[model samples]
Target: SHEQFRAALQLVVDPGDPRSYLDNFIKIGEGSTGIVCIATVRSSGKLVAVKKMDLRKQQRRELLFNEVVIMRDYQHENVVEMYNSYLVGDELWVVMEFLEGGALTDIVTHTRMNEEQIAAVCLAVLQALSVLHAQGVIHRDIKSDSILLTHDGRVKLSDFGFCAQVSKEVPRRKSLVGTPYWMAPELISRLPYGPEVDIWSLGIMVIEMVDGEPPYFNEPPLKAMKMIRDNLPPRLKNLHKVSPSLKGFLDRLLVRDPAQRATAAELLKHPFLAKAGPPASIVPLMRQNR
Candidate 1:
């Protein structure tokens, strides 16, 4: 059983050149740590997204590589899947599934999402968080930009560059990671935190979906951190338009105390998620953004 489990979790780390296996590269986006491109897998003739990180420029090499390890071990429908990884020259190329619908940030910025659509997105992300949290992993970056959608309206979580793993010996994290606007209060205060931080980020993301932008969207990073640290939980501007169930769900997540914050599994059972329409309901919004 150990051998079989190892075979399932093993990642395909190619020793040869990445160009030999992948071609037709088109730059799609760039992050602080790497460049993302859509490329064709030579053998399968399938489209895949490749994230190329320069090893020479990396300072937190272990943190960057932790993403690959997490992806290799965790395979779920709501989480982005990594096909393989390559170490070529001074770079590390991670090939992943291509999602044609692009990032959730595009949809939220360009189109208005109904409550049902927002609930669907929330349900999908919660499913992914449930899986990761159960395994003692925290997806520190859980903003709209890190959420991607497939052409068919399937929502999935991506970008694990800031992910951290916790164990019995080290049960909480104190590092200040993630975007300031979406960060949990405990994280801003340098308090030891756990997976509940992801829940807080998800709450902020829900506000972004309901409203046009997150609270303190225009503030400087320092001011935003202060507001998030000292201010009460951010509220939806269009509170009258949101259903009570949805409001209750947000309330559960935006709690200041990490211990009191609802976990992903708990929120998954909330009434709001139960009433969510099928994932396909978000397809029209995706088309509108395109």
Candidate 2:
């Protein structure tokens, strides 16, 4: 009966908008898909981020629907919330949470992060991953740019355009997706991959947080992938200043073989994260440069 119910109720609706209800909107950023902006709801004075995507192409339209469905199913504190969405002709407007502290890349560029801050960030991200993995989702892209922060320092995983699903029936994905520098070796090789790939990207994010860059920062994209193919895992540049436990944590995640890598659930209990600060502390450290 449940299977039959699932078969019949497959239809879903897009959230509506007058397309003018958002008042005093300001364009925030843009990408290949469309523009992102901050807007206030005229009805309640609520702040929200609106991503307007052009759906003229079949591929982009497919990705938009996939992103919407994936985001709608996620209900974690560390994940971004998608409140509503609207479709108007060739455009899709997504109304979601507005994170003011901005992307983690801003913090990485403006401040030198300590181990505790980095660990705290990993803790939130890994916690989100644990939930995602359990629900058959893999965040194909995991990097500083996709990580958003609230003014109070809460970590919210964003950018689901590359998010994917895997299950026993379809145990792995073979798409060559993800940011070049942060991509896992398996992904670069276009080999079938599961959720473990995100762990490797997390390892890169750790290095990026402390060193202000992932490995091969100066290399071209193809060269970077070649380096990754040659079994070169990224390392924290300031090794002497890093403690053994922290180094070990990074070591476990950066393992070339996904089988040897640590899962988010396992890393959540690792020594480094065991002592990491709460997410609320992230805001203060990010503001140090100010």
Best by TM-score: 1
Question: What lDDT score goes with residue 106 in model 2?
Answer: 80
Model 2 stretches astray by more than 4 angstroms: 1-15, 18-20, 57-61, 287-289
Model 1, position 254: C-alpha lDDT score: 95
What would the per-residue lDDT of candidate 2 be over residues 99-142, giving only the tens digit for each residue? 98888988887778788888889989998999999988999889
**TM-score against native, each model:** 0.92, 0.91
What is candidate 2's TM-score against the reference? 0.91
Number of backbone collisions per candidate: 0, 0
Against the reference, the lDDT scores of all candidates come to 0.87, 0.82
Error of 1 at 269 (Å): 0.9
Show the lowest summed lDDT stretch of 10 residues, model 1. 2-11
Q: For model 1, how does the per-residue alpha-carbon lDDT over 130-224 read when each residue is reduced to its tens digit? A: 98899999999999999999988999999999999998999999988889999999999999999999999999999999897889999998899
